[PDB]
Amino acid sequence: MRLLVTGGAGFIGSHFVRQLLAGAYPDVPADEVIVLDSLTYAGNRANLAPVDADPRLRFVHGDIRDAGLLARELRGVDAIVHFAAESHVDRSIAGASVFTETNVQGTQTLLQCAVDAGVGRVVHVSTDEVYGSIDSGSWTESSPLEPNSPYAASKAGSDLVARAYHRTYGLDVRITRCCNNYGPYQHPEKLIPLFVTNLLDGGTLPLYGDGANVREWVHTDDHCRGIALVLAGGRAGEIYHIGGGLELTNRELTGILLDSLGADWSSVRKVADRKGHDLRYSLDGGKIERELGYRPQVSFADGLARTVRWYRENRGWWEPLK
Template sequence: MPLTISIIGAAGFVGTNLALAALEAGHQVHLVDVSDRLGRLRSSGLLDRAPHQFVDLARPGARLDHPADVIIHLAALPQVDFSLYEPARVLTNNTAVTAAVLESARTRNVPVLFASSIEVYGGNDGALFTETSPLLPLSPYAASKISCEEYLTSLRHGFGTETTTVRLTNLYGPWQAPDRIVPRVVAQGLSGMKSEAVTGRLRDFLAVEDAVRALLGLVERGLWGETFNLAAGRHTGLEEVTDTIARLTGSGPVVRATTPVKDGRGPSLVASPARLEERLGWRARVPLPDGLRGTVSWYAEHESWWRRFEAQFGADRDGPHFLLDHEYPFWAE
């Protein structure tokens, strides 16, 4: 049955891919974001295919202005790195937007699927995190997600608002800004630049097409009142990912960098998708080598979108200037 889906944070990486997949599946979508500041909605054709509302939901009195069967709330200042430079801004923005979204959902009796992050677990020495693992926020970004999760829980118990939380792993794919590890190294490789990879880090990489398939499956099935890890559950060293991209782009060897003592991340951050597999029948389909190959091909074919961010993916990571949220702040518009 087709749904009318309100996508909050529709101009983001996941939001753009989700909106395209939802339209392909026959759903109607309403796009909500502060703006299309990185040009994803325009470049993907979504501005011509779906109604949109540009509004800063963190501002007092901001409201959603359209009906919906379900809300998928993706909006956030999403970078661990950015939150280390702007901790108060990240916490304030992410909790305020979530409060506004949930107030709209509560008063209109609309269910909400909330995108959290496996960053809430902090990190460990290699064991898979489950949904009942202790939470350990090592960054203000992670703390903001935990705060939002708790607010969802309070509304579910106090007002009967239907909500579900998904904790997203490291996603990659089309339309991801090149201040993240995969698109950054892809853009550097296609530009003939040297790349750097931190050693000693184990992460879990999931193709965004697999992620949006799970998000749509959850709202189509109406699986409310739960928390799910949305992950592949595979330990992968950052060196393996960057070396694969270097081979695909034909760039030179990747420079190895030692792991900083403290930067808001643990050594291993990989979550189990077993609960999602059991409840939804979902499994990751895209093998990492195939997903990286497809991602490199997409970036090679869409240079007109990412080339304007060369100053950011060409900058080193010793300061904030490689971060697009720092260089393209929505609050300065």
């Protein structure tokens, strides 16, 4: 019952850690949790402050690319949940190399070390962006990889590395793919926290192009619960989509955020569109539901409300990040 969580000081990773330690995943027993995080601009020790008193938690400031470190930290580890990654599309367009480096090479290093340490199973956390764009309908686990951005191409490359580790060495690795997450502790470079915090700072909102692009949104709590279900009961080598997604154009979402804050359209500015911007993401989550029983439980309206309030009450957390 010794687990290692990479990227556990980031947004999603920290939520998984806080929840696991809170006992929200009865089927994943945690006797000892090691968090490995290199603390890039996106990692934040404060995301784990609510649990730093936990005796079961060991925090390791280090890199997934460090084979030396992993060979030692993975001794006796039964399972790994891998969240560590460069995760922002805009950064990837501005400076792609670090995406290959952390995402593809880091994943290769981590999995090789897992094989050398005899780790039981690994959950590789991935994204819907690997599928490109979809005008109508939703993608299934058999949809083809047609990444458009360097970030998406790096995440797809890392999913291929996972497949090879399972096929060649017999590593029990499971892959999850999810839509856009939202919730407390999300870095303010991401759409929702960026727009909410700009508003709180009395600023404008940079809406790309026309705002017609479509994304599906899931509360990170639901995403993390699906990851725990896969950890506990998925099958080696399988891919699972974690749905939930309420589908919105960015325009309509912008409107919901303005309302949630008492603001108006005059706060929005239309900016030049993102290079190669994906028009629409939509994931079909029937497989995980039929196989593992997963269904989202946080409605957008409630989740979003709690999220906005969190930002309103935590300027001390986000201010420094901007």
